Amino acid sequence: PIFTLNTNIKATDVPSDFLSSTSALVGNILSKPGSYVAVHINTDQQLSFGGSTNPAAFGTLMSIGGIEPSRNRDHSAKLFDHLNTKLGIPKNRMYIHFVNLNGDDVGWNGTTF
Amino acid sequence: PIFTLNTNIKATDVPSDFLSSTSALVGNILSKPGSYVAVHINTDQQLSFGGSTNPAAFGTLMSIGGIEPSRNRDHSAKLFDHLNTKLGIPKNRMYIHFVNLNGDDVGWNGTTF
Amino acid sequence: PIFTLNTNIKATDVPSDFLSSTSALVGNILSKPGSYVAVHINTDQQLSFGGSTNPAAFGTLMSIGGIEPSRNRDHSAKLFDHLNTKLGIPKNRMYIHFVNLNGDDVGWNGTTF
């Protein structure tokens, strides 16, 4: 799995345990081993949400399986609570695109799944 | 909707009204309220187009379209003019991936559409 | 085509010819002219793989044609070999999402393809 986020907040405002806590949450919610979980946060970005440059973010959570309509609502509740808690960004100022990948479209270790 | 752009131009060359003006523009072409519009630009990126590192950019415009047409050609013309007039970037050196999102795959305010 | 990659390695650690050789390679594997190839690398990113911030990366390769289930494993072997050589990043610490694009949803110049 990959969780990638773009935000306008400052890097110094991302806690030291952000990558670990996010890696843990992503693996636990998608039921994937932590060794396959990648987390990325791009901070200090020029980003406007709803016409304001106040703290906001948008990102994507992609994974081969574990993601589908009948599950994204729960995924969202947990991820938004987590991000609001760690970065302090309001839940109505964040978007997350959930993507269910096909193994054949994902390269890893020089091969595909 | 979300409009995110990556480009190799300097951050200083981006107009201070870019975000506000791009946000209003996006809400217009997609006929979506500004309250749901997010705009993001990542500048100073190491980006080569056609083998040269001259001014160029690539991005995505995502929105939940549902039971509606495409209009990507009209969107691209209106968007490229905007980006070209505002950033001065050559239109033949910019790609824009148009993505029609399914509400169930989009997380917002701790829930999904 | 567009090959965009995010990595935690330092910007100066990216060889001056990375964009050049990568552009040539992408064009080669997809049988596409270099003039339509865009390569992007976002370095110095806060990114973990398996919870570790040791060298790692993830990216996307998108193209209107050339990307298909029957072709991506060969693309992967070639791209991972190239990235591991150029960037020194272990192959089991990189992900590449292969995306085949429809010309109808790709903006260039001022219209689509």
Distance of alpha carbon B36 from alpha carbon B46, whole angstroms? 30
Q: Is A108's CB within 8 Å of C98's CB?
A: no
Question: b/e string for B51-73 if b means 16 or more Cβ within 10 A?
Answer: beeebbbbbbbbbbbeeeeeebe
Interhelix angle B72-87/B18-29, rounded to 10 degrees, is 170
Q: Is C23's CB within 8 Å of B73's CB?
A: no
Tell whether C64 is in a known binding site: yes
State how far Cα A29 lies from the chain centre. Answer: 12
In this structure, what token pair is assigned to residue A30?
């998608």
- Domains annotated for chain A, with CATH where assigned, are 1-113 (3.30.429.10)
State how far Cα A35 lies from the chain centre. Answer: 16
| Nearest Cα to Cα of residue A47 among C108, C44, B40 | B40
Distance of alpha carbon C102 from alpha carbon C109, whole angstroms? 16
The three-class DSSP label of residue B26 is helix
Residue with tokens 């509400």: B103
Under a CB-based contact definition with an 8 Å cutoff, are residues A56 and B109 in contact? no
Tell whether B78 is in a known binding site: no
Beta bridge partners of B49: B52, C38
Distance of alpha carbon C6 from alpha carbon C8, whole angstroms? 7
How far CA C29 is from CA of B49, C1, C37, C66, C73, in Å, comes to 17, 11, 12, 8, 12
Q: Is C107's CB within 8 Å of B99's CB?
A: no
Which residues of C fall within a CB distance of 8 Å from A107? Answer: 72-73, 75-76, 79-80, 94-98
Under a CB-based contact definition with an 8 Å cutoff, are residues A28 and A22 in contact? no
Distance of alpha carbon B73 from alpha carbon B99, whole angstroms? 13
Residue C36 dihedral angles phi and psi, to the nearest 5°: -105, 5
SS (H, E, C) chain C: CEEEEEECCCHHHCCCCHHHHHHHHHHHHHCCCHHHCEEEEECCCEEEECCECCCCEEEEEEECCCCCCCCHHHHHHHHHHHHHHHHCCCHHHEEEEEEECCHHHEEECCECC
Distance of alpha carbon C110 from alpha carbon B75, whole angstroms? 9
Under a CB-based contact definition with an 8 Å cutoff, are residues B48 and C19 in contact? yes
Å between A10 CA and nearest CA of chain B: 15
Nearest CA in chain C to A99: C97
